[PDB]
Amino acid sequence: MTWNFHQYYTNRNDGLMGKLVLTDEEKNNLKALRKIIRLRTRDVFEEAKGIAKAVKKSALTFEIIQEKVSTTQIKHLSDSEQREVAKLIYEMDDDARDEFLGLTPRFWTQGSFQYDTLNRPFQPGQEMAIADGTYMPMPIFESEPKIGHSLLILLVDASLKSLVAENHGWKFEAKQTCGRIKIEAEKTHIDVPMYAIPKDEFQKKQIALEANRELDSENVNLALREGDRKWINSDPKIVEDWFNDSCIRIGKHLRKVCRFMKAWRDAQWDVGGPSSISLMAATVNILDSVAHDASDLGETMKIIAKHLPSEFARGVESPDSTDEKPLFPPSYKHGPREMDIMSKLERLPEILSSAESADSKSEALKKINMAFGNRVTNSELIVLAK
Template identity: 25%
Template sequence: MAECNDLFLKFNDEIKLGSEKKKSLRKSRNAVGKDIQKYFDETLKVTKPKFWGQGSYMMNTIINPIEGEYDLDSGVYLMHLSDVEEEDWPATSTVHNWIKNAVKNRTSTPPQDKNTCIRVIYKDDYHVDLPIYIKNKDMEHPKLAHKSKGWIDSDPKELTKWFTDEVKEKSDQLKRIVRYFKAWKDFKANGDKFPSGMIFTILTANHYVEGYEENDDSAFVAVAKEIYDTLDENFSLDRPVFPKEELLEGWSETAKNNFLSKLSTLITNGQKALEEENKEEASKIWIKVFGDRLPKYTPPKEENRMDKGYALQTTEPPVLGNYGRSS
């Protein structure tokens, strides 16, 4: 059976955030942080906030989008309120205005005031989201400034730690499979409702299948099948850490069925690719799943050459065993 692990690893290199882009994003994030600290120091004249990266950038599962913007999240922790009781905290609209005013001149596009963050938009196809938190000395977890809901439970550090521990227990393959699901969504969503990157991250960790560590193609199909079987039986997902909440709440039956249908098609095509004996044909199937960022396999050309009177002929590498078993 055709084995396409090498093509998947090349695909991972294509969609994974490169070192230069990572450096550029980090530079922009740090510049935004300096703006905020300067505003708090010079204008508000209070203790400067601290920052904590969160989301896919910190988990190292962020991907290069086909179109659209990179999403970078940097939590802003208001240290000057850490000794203040919650009933005396300012309104969430007030702290949103502080951050918005602090970064208003950072880019030519005005910052957006969203429910859960202030968004700084850069022209180089990326933005920095700035969720705002307070954690006083008596609280185990911080609270997020939600513009319409007030101060709500939220602790992104817990989710980052949880995923880091999952990777340590399983392997770096877990991060690659998360990237593959995000790339599949990027190619296939076309405006349809798909799970968020965070939800794909949790689903992949929850349904990781051991035994395919050297074969990302087989591992991806095995995990997809586990996710499908679980969601088809019960379309539900709990956040694995504080705050415990249902993450798939609010999906309509149409949206659920549409997503499960796409996931089923992914599994069917993936299984066909795993069972295909010709690697070139298998790669064509995978390209239909992910798009042409996944490389097409081209068989090496046979060549004859003479060396000291002997004819040496190159041969194609042997096809490995059957990795098409389902899980």
């Protein structure tokens, strides 16, 4: 016996894609959540700007400024955080205060929601994620921009915390690269990294955009929450463009197989396993260099599973040239975490082979479900090879 799994993988109702692709409820939910954060963040920034402009209008004391702060949504910060915001607004010099009054936060979602490879969570504790970056158009800087790193972080945190304060079952979490809202009961969290981008360039492109119906990566700076290094050059559009380009170059099946590999990962580890981006990059390298047939994703997945251990062993380069660190280290550097990852990857082609030569459709299903978990239950998707 030899079985074909193309329908197992791709059927949009009962097949693996049918089980991975977010429901409408889930997808509209994530969009509603993102919209809610965007609205509050713009509101919080206006409230702060309103105070700034009152300082510009007439020299207000520091005590008056603390008073005004305490009545805005910034009141959801800690009392030390609140006075920190008041101090920063009070201390801003004329140049910085003008720039701040010009600042309007802009938004852009990154990650799997944007790559369109966001899977429904499998194991308990696994969550849907969405990252919506907040971008701050400001003059080009080195060291520190006119509008402080500190002030920008506090206002974004104030936005998130004001939303948490309005929602039972929401929780705020501060991370090194973002603020986070988690809604455990909805298996959802939203990340908000903050970026500085050149203002003059942003304005120029925006005018052309509206007239005709991207920014220079080197000056896109990710804010870091702690440590000596407040900013780092990091442009999420690099990876985003690379992946979209890869999809065009390889074909529409690229997104499906990346979903399958992420689903494999979610089934093999409740927590941990290779990052999604290392799997996508390794898969892209394989499909770029190995002949395969998109009309049979059963066969294509066997090709992928066969070549992934070699990809990971030699180490997986980031498609972003400016990242020094690989997405995954080469063998001579592997510790326990990577060794565990190598063992799982080496097992995959064995699993897919045993499914292919199972005695029946029901056993073929059980065997391939060792790789992806028991999500697909309709064994009739599995057909005899011709």
